[PDB]
Amino acid sequence: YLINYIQDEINTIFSDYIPYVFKLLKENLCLNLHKFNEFIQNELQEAS
Amino acid sequence: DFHSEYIVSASNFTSQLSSQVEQFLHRNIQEYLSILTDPDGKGKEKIA
Amino acid sequence: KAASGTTGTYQEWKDKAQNLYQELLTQEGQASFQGLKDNVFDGLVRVT
């Protein structure tokens, strides 16, 4: 039973979870970039 | 000001370019389904 | 004559290829092996 179970699990994961992981990476990239902008703005204010 | 101008463009291009990977992954999923599917028939026409 | 014979043989053997494809699909479904396990377990019990 577990052989067929894992076969189905991998077939589902490839087509389902992988795009979600890519989306997670994209969202994290954008969020980190925006946080970088905020922190550099604060640091530049302090330096000025 | 320059930093904010760069950040906005960087985030926009990150989001836009990063989305292309999902389309390619969907094409790969289509190929995976095709391979999971058994071929048949067309070989006889080609050999004729 | 050689071309005709080759085409005939290929078309003849195309069918068993598709039968084997169906058997492979069944195997991937893991629905033809449990019976062998039951038979070997019964033989083991008898020998024991």
Q: At B39, phi and psi to the nearest 5?
A: -80, 165
Q: At what angle do helices A2-47 and B20-36 cross, to 10 degrees?
A: 170
Resolution in A: 9.0
Q: Select from C25, C43, A30, A8 the least CA-distant residue to B38.
A: C25
C-alpha distances in Å from residue A17, one per residue of A41, B23, B33, C13: 36, 14, 16, 40
Question: B33: Cβ–Cβ under 8 A, 6 or more apart, which residues?
Answer: none
Q: Alpha-carbon distance B35 to A8, whole Å?
A: 15
The verdict on A2 touching C (C-beta cutoff 8 Å) is no
Q: Residue with structure tokens 């703005």? A: A41
B35: its two tokens: 């391979």
C21 touches chain B (CB under 8 A): yes
CA distance to partner chain A, nearest, from residue B15 (Å): 6
Token couple for A25: 């990476």
Tokens of A24: 């997670």
